[PDB]
């Protein structure tokens, strides 16, 4: 996360993922809870040094207006295909 600070074009950094599948589908799920605690401790040291401004998405929405205008976004999921729900099982059609 800190190596993104050196890049000056990185204005807003966003991470989005399932909040509970990663702590339950790992090999040893309890260690993933220790991971979260140590991680949140580490990211709190990047906000007291003022490297990052830890905030919520609603706060970023008000603080940073959206200036550039996109005109079209093609239809897609975050897996690059819709064949996961229509096509990857023989009895989908």
């Amino acid at each position: 996360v800190a190596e993104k600070w050196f890049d000056k074009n990185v204005k807003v950094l966003t991470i989005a993922l399932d909040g509970e599948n990663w702590m339950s589908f790992s090999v040893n799920p309890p260690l993933t809870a220790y991971f979260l605690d140590k991680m949140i401790i580490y990211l709190e040291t990047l906000s007291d040094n003022k490297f990052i401004k830890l905030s919520t998405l609603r706060e970023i929405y008000n603080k940073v207006p959206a200036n550039r205008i996109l005109t079209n976004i093609p239809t897609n999921s975050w897996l690059g295909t819709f064949r996961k729900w229509r096509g990857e099982v023989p009895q989908h059609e």
């Binding site: 050196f6 807003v12 909040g19 309890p30 605690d37 949140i40 830890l54 919520t56």
Partner: protein, 83 residues
Amino acid sequence: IDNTCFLVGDPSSREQMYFTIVWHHHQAPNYLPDGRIHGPWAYIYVWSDLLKPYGKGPYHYHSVMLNIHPHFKATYNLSPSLL
């Protein structure tokens, strides 16, 4: 032994980047038309011994970390079907 590098920089060089994370908490509506529950994942991920000895379940663990760390902000998606 491994190359555990670290970083040095001047916090005043640039405007600090706005940082946020989105957690997507969701379970499908797992009740039958009668009302009985066929998919128990909204519940066993709140009261199982899955994150033992550090917590009960992912949904409850994320809630207790919000009390443990009162300075850590994050955006959450509590799915309406889960709520």
